[PDB]
Enzyme design. Structure first.
Site, PDB file in Angstrom:
ATOM      1  N   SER A 152       0.833  -1.187   0.000  1.00 27.25           N
ATOM      2  CA  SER A 152       0.000   0.000   0.000  1.00 27.25           C
ATOM      3  C   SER A 152       0.864   1.231   0.000  1.00 27.25           C
ATOM      4  O   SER A 152       2.023   1.174   0.395  1.00 27.25           O
ATOM      5  CB  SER A 152      -0.868   0.031   1.250  1.00 27.25           C
ATOM      6  OG  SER A 152      -1.544   1.269   1.399  1.00 27.25           O
ATOM      7  N   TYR A 166      -2.206  -0.051  10.598  1.00 32.03           N
ATOM      8  CA  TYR A 166      -2.364  -0.490   9.212  1.00 32.03           C
ATOM      9  C   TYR A 166      -1.116  -0.204   8.368  1.00 32.03           C
ATOM     10  O   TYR A 166      -0.593  -1.097   7.672  1.00 32.03           O
ATOM     11  CB  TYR A 166      -3.594   0.179   8.577  1.00 32.03           C
ATOM     12  CG  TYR A 166      -3.814  -0.177   7.121  1.00 32.03           C
ATOM     13  CD1 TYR A 166      -4.309  -1.433   6.754  1.00 32.03           C
ATOM     14  CD2 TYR A 166      -3.511   0.736   6.107  1.00 32.03           C
ATOM     15  CE1 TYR A 166      -4.498  -1.767   5.413  1.00 32.03           C
ATOM     16  CE2 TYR A 166      -3.697   0.407   4.762  1.00 32.03           C
ATOM     17  CZ  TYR A 166      -4.190  -0.842   4.424  1.00 32.03           C
ATOM     18  OH  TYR A 166      -4.384  -1.165   3.104  1.00 32.03           O
ATOM     19  N   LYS A 170       1.581  -3.002   6.450  1.00 35.09           N
ATOM     20  CA  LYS A 170       1.859  -2.967   5.005  1.00 35.09           C
ATOM     21  C   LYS A 170       3.326  -2.668   4.719  1.00 35.09           C
ATOM     22  O   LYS A 170       3.880  -3.192   3.757  1.00 35.09           O
ATOM     23  CB  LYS A 170       0.961  -1.941   4.280  1.00 35.09           C
ATOM     24  CG  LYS A 170      -0.533  -2.309   4.239  1.00 35.09           C
ATOM     25  CD  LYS A 170      -0.766  -3.663   3.580  1.00 35.09           C
ATOM     26  CE  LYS A 170      -2.266  -3.891   3.339  1.00 35.09           C
ATOM     27  NZ  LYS A 170      -2.453  -5.120   2.543  1.00 35.09           N
ATOM     28  N   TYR A 211      -8.833   9.669   5.190  1.00 38.68           N
ATOM     29  CA  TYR A 211      -7.622  10.153   4.536  1.00 38.68           C
ATOM     30  C   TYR A 211      -7.800  11.568   4.049  1.00 38.68           C
ATOM     31  O   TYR A 211      -6.924  12.110   3.391  1.00 38.68           O
ATOM     32  CB  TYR A 211      -7.316   9.301   3.318  1.00 38.68           C
ATOM     33  CG  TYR A 211      -6.976   7.877   3.615  1.00 38.68           C
ATOM     34  CD1 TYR A 211      -7.971   6.914   3.756  1.00 38.68           C
ATOM     35  CD2 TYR A 211      -5.650   7.465   3.668  1.00 38.68           C
ATOM     36  CE1 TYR A 211      -7.647   5.574   3.919  1.00 38.68           C
ATOM     37  CE2 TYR A 211      -5.321   6.126   3.834  1.00 38.68           C
ATOM     38  CZ  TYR A 211      -6.319   5.191   3.951  1.00 38.68           C
ATOM     39  OH  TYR A 211      -5.975   3.867   4.023  1.00 38.68           O
TER      40      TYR A 211
END
Ligand code: NDP
Ligand code: NDP
Ligand code: NDP
Ligand code: NDP
Ligand code: NID
Ligand code: NID
Ligand code: NID
Ligand code: NID
Lengths: 271, 271, 273, 273
Positions: A152, A166, A170, A211
């Site tokens: 990601s 998270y 990743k 985001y």
């Protein structure tokens, strides 16, 4: 050392007669990976954990397009499910050429608020799960096989707040690619990581506004405009097919000298 | 926005009157971090999990050099130990200015051989442990505090085989730094990661030859020559003090504009 | 076992620059000026280079002396290799040796790739890239064994959202590669080579082109520009200043920076650009 | 919802370069030659640029025609901006438009930083950095909306163990920064800009300086050099070839490379240098 690896010309991009397994292929990006791989000539094994009907639907659509397909249930958070999924898989079509480790979950929260249960929830799937899917993949893949992990933009991003868990799960995948690229090469298998920017899926619909600064009250229409203008000079939103296409390239002979790499697919985003 | 942050001149490097906590400070790099921080004027809280006598020895040596110190037992693989360690810590000296997340374990093995028990062993300490030490650190640090995480050259290395588990646990830390740098800034706390190359410690003595091709039969003398000539143009081996010095810089006002960064300390190594 | 020898002194003396001799290019203004001042405060003798700002250079020299250290200015344009060679020859004549070299001199540039002229491309690369490379060549030759070389980079070398900035950004990005490559060569004399990469920093350069980094910022007041820089480019919520960079340069120049070589140190307050 | 539109065709046609028109600088030899050949095999009309190798250029053109596509050569030296401008003007006159531009031309260089002359520094940067930048300027102006621009970088831009290589390495490292910055600008015409960064690849360049990357390799036979390259630079245990790069260039040039912009693609077999 001068012998040409594979055919010269357009055939080097062909995935004709290959057998691929994709985790979490019943929805989102995984679904498109399976569809596109099927369109290029692959027999596809659609893994799912919960979405049973969706999985049977992806299998049907792939047959409709001219390729065989089958689904297999397995939860990556349980190493034993992963072990059997791979044993079932090789029995279905007789071999395994490409493995796409796609399954994943998302999470948002200020560091001060993270609980050990949430931290474990995410890492068991996004990191530990991908690791063990990769382990079994190594054992079962054909010599000259392929393994594409799912990263990601968050692994390297610098402005997304409340996203350490998270993002870290990743970021670890980029390191795995480099290290696994070394070990798995004893079977001529390449290992790379795809790092997409925002892509329109169920995941996207659920946390897109996290985001976006002050984006809690944005309409779905407004969220996409922001994503299009803010995260890409090309001025459009990312879509599952954008990722599926790159996965197919890596899976083909065209990607034979690409290993241990992190391929960013985000339309020139800066996050 | 033109107001100068902190004093001009040599005083900006002073750690006089600061209170620091270092995990795994009874041995290795952690021990040197505590010693050096003490020499620069810090009251140091020496955490340990097993090495009880060594811990009491580090505490004594620090007092001998002119600074107060105390030890606290806590295993980072247990969130509850971390929670109480920090509660004890603030009671000892009354506040906390610097936190050095140093504790860690090493591991080597081909991907095909990794067991879920070994994978969990490593990640619970190197990744999950550092994450929770960081969580508690945030809650307890003074405004304008410091948090230095412990990474490794392995997070980005490209030639160390059979090292995915350990490498990945350290690679995740570089991502945490960037993400935590954002969240923790609401308390004016900086967060960085130190990424050392090989450093002579007990860890080094146990697995140094695993990083050396055909080095199983090397004498300790030969291992150091290889490390000196192969991993550094400066032609010498890395030492705990090499790291302790950089930690002190980050911990001082001199590192006030350095946050969200990964500082490599390996003497120009290529691994 | 010879490998067990501790390099340098334990404790806070390792951070000392007392009695060291440093040269800073473009030290009459901005970040270069603050590097010389701060290095001066930590006990270094400083050679203040300048290409145009004569009176300002003389002022930096006088201020360093007033703070208790010795200094002297030397005129040289990094676009002319010959000026650099003679600048280093004059440098060693003034204080006898050279311990620290800070390659700071630089110019900025904005322009859509379609509009860049070869004259503008060369204007920038000759100073920012070719200039630093030749200042580095001479620094190697004249530096004390165990010396230091700090090159000036920028956040733009890796930035992803600044439009119409390929020339400048590319001229700085090359420096990050020079550091890794020069760290290998210069190590035969135990010299360490690193690159500092600042984010926005309030200087004359900043005042001239700050708005170019801000989308629709052409009409922003200076007060609004700083607020944007403070809130948008840093979670810490403040603007960057020459001292923020000067402090990190001093660390690298000290024994504390001994195991740090071939690295890029970003100093931008956690910016995302 | 307009954002839900699928860009391009689903399935294997997305990998097609049928009927496209591409220009490759330095296509008479090496990697540039193989890019033109492979692009030719996937259905592109190719303009084969060359600066010196006239006869070799004519041979590449003839071979492409024999494989079923049309081609033509154009002489131009990237050191002269004017030659580049006229090369693109002649290009569009030949096939009518331009869809793909592969900036491949480059020269190598080795030398301890202390020994580098300004003439050698300029020799390399004018071709490797300044040349690519101006080939990119013209590519933008003349490319079809939705076109492609692939720049040539190298593993050396990030490498950490190659000594006496700051000039070349720095000239390539700047390209990685050009990609990120040019991807922003050129996007106003929906053109994608990426950098391919090969590891060692067997060409004329490789045969001339391969041993310079190998510690104490001055006496190695060609057979021993390849074994070293195969075993030391790749877990896959083989040497890199022009086709390994050509294939990735074709991917980037196709609709498959549509969401890949502002990126550096390393193609070195998992090398560590
Ligand atoms: N969309 C985006 O913006 C981005 C997504 N990604 C990554 O791409 C991947 C797919 O994302 P996206 O399609 O949006 O996600 P969705 O939320 O739409 O779901 C993706 C898949 O994850 C599967 N999954 C979840 N848990 C498990 C489990 N325990 N075992 C096996 N499979 C599981 C789901 O299957 P099931 O229905 O059976 O639960 C589903 O098939 C993820 O790894 C994600 O983190 C990366 C960058 C961006
Ligand atoms: N030495 C090297 O080459 C490099 C080391 N590092 C990292 O630096 C750190 C220190 O390494 P080094 O000093 O060599 O290591 P050592 O093996 O010498 O031990 C380091 C410390 O880790 C502590 N520790 C282990 N488990 C725990 C736990 N469960 N809870 C709390 N503390 C624990 C140990 O304390 P105890 O005795 O009580 O068990 C010890 O104090 C590690 O994170 C390591 O991975 C990074 C790069 C290189
Ligand atoms: N300000 C910022 O935000 C950032 C700046 N930087 C870099 O830091 C450095 C200095 O920046 P800043 O202080 O803001 O710059 P200013 O524009 O304020 O001044 C820079 C210095 O460059 C010198 N200089 C210019 N041309 C030459 C030349 N031909 N030969 C020798 N010296 C020369 C000038 O000296 P003179 O008066 O004699 O001409 C001046 O001292 C530059 O390299 C810049 O790219 C990097 C990131 C951010
Ligand atoms: N070989 C390798 O291992 C690697 C190569 N590269 C890069 O790939 C590119 C090509 O490499 P390779 O094929 O090995 O190189 P060669 O040395 O075999 O030839 C390179 C090409 O550059 C051309 N060229 C040189 N000068 C000019 C000029 N002034 N104007 C226009 N064209 C010019 C040459 O054409 P002409 O005959 O007319 O002079 C030739 O076609 C270079 O940019 C190189 O740096 C990157 C990584 C590895
Ligand atoms: O990794 C990601 C998962 C969701 C996402 C990611 C990156 C950027 C944007 C979004 N989004 O959902 O909007
Ligand atoms: O992270 C590391 C732990 C040990 C080590 C590391 C990097 C390089 C060398 C060695 N060593 O032990 O030799
Ligand atoms: O490199 C730079 C020169 C100026 C600048 C840079 C980066 C970020 C901001 C600004 N500024 O001037 O505002
Ligand atoms: O950039 C390069 C030019 C030549 C080369 C490069 C990288 C690695 C090896 C080799 N070689 O020639 O052997």
């Amino acid at each position: 050392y001068d012998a040409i690896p594979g055919p010269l010309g357009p055939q080097s991009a062909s995935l004709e007669g290959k057998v691929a397994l994709v985790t979490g292929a019943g929805r989102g990006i995984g679904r498109e990976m399976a569809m596109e791989l099927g369109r290029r000539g692959c027999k596809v094994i659609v893994n799912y954990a919960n979405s049973t009907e969706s999985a049977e639907e992806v299998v049907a659509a792939i047959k409709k397009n001219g390729s065989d397909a089958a689904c297999v249930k397995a939860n990556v958070g349980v190493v034993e499910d992963i072990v059997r999924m791979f044993e079932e898989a090789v029995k279905i079509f007789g071999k395994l050429d490409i493995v796409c480790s796609n399954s994943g979950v998302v999470s948002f929260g200020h560091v001060k608020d993270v609980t050990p249960e949430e931290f474990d929830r995410v890492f068991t799937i996004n990191t530990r799960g991908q690791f063990f899917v990769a382990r079994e993949a190594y054992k079962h893949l054909e010599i000259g096989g392929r393994l594409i992990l799912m990263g990601s933009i968050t692994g390297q991003a610098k402005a997304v707040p409340k996203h350490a868990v998270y993002s870290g799960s990743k970021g670890a995948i980029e390191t795995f690619a480099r290290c696994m690229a070394i070990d798995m090469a004893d079977k001529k298998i390449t290992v790379n990581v795809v790092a997409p920017g925002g892509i329109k899926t169920d995941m996207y619909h659920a946390v897109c506004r996290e985001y976006i600064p002050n984006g809690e009250n944005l309409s779905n229409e407004e969220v996409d405009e922001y994503a299009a203008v803010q995260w890409s000079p090309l001025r459009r939103v990312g879509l599952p097919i954008d990722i599926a296409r790159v996965v197919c390239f890596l899976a083909s002979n065209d990607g034979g000298w690409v290993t241990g790499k992190v391929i960013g697919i985000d339309g020139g985003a800066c996050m």
